[PDB]
Design a protein around this ligand. Structure first.
Ligand SMILES: Cc1cc2nc3c(=O)[nH]c(=O)nc-3n(C[C@H](O)[C@H](O)[C@H](O)COP(=O)(O)O)c2cc1C
Length: 147
């Protein structure tokens, strides 16, 4: 099986989290392709992948805004090949904000409309993800067991 991880990260937190998940999946036997959202195009992005994991941090002055590099992908999600695709989401944030990891919710909701199959509720990391390593590894393991 092939898994794609696409992340939008500005300060490196969601990127670390994506790398952590990627190693877990690889150790299990998946062929993993991990890509920064800045480097991808939406159109047919998910083609060929058995599992897609999308990660993004949350921004915005007084609204929920997705990480800049992820925005174009979210805006064109309908062209990615999400129907019937097994997906799960993750993100980093900071619980000082009420809309903690709000990006994750926005992405999940769109995916559901698009007919994707959300295999596990999104992983939401507060603060330094290295401090949450066990939680990330545990979530990767739960995603695997949910396929
Ligand atoms: C202006 C600003 C707005 C933010 N808004 C949110 C927010 O609504 N929800 C949240 O959970 N975190 C918010 N954050 C926290 C970032 O998402 C958090 O620093 C995160 O670790 C960045 O992840 P990244 O390094 O992968 O981009 C905000 C941070 C800044 C500076």
């Amino acid at each position: 099986p092939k898994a794609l991880i696409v992340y939008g990260s500005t300060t490196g937190n969601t990127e670390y989290t994506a790398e952590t998940i990627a190693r877990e999946l690889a150790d299990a036997g998946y062929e993993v392709d991990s890509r920064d959202a800045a480097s991808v195009e939406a159109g047919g992005l998910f083609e060929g992948f058995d599992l897609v994991l999308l990660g993004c941090s949350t921004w915005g002055d007084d609204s929920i805004e997705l990480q800049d590099d992820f925005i174009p992908l979210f805006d064109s999600l309908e062209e990615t090949g999400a129907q019937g695709r097994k997906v799960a989401c993750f993100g980093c944030g900071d619980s000082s904000w009420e809309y903690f990891c709000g990006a994750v919710d926005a992405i999940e909701e769109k995916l559901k409309n698009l007919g994707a199959e959300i295999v596990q509720d999104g992983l939401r990391i507060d603060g330094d993800p290295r401090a949450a390593r066990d939680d990330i590894v545990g979530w990767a393991h739960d995603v695997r067991g949910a396929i």
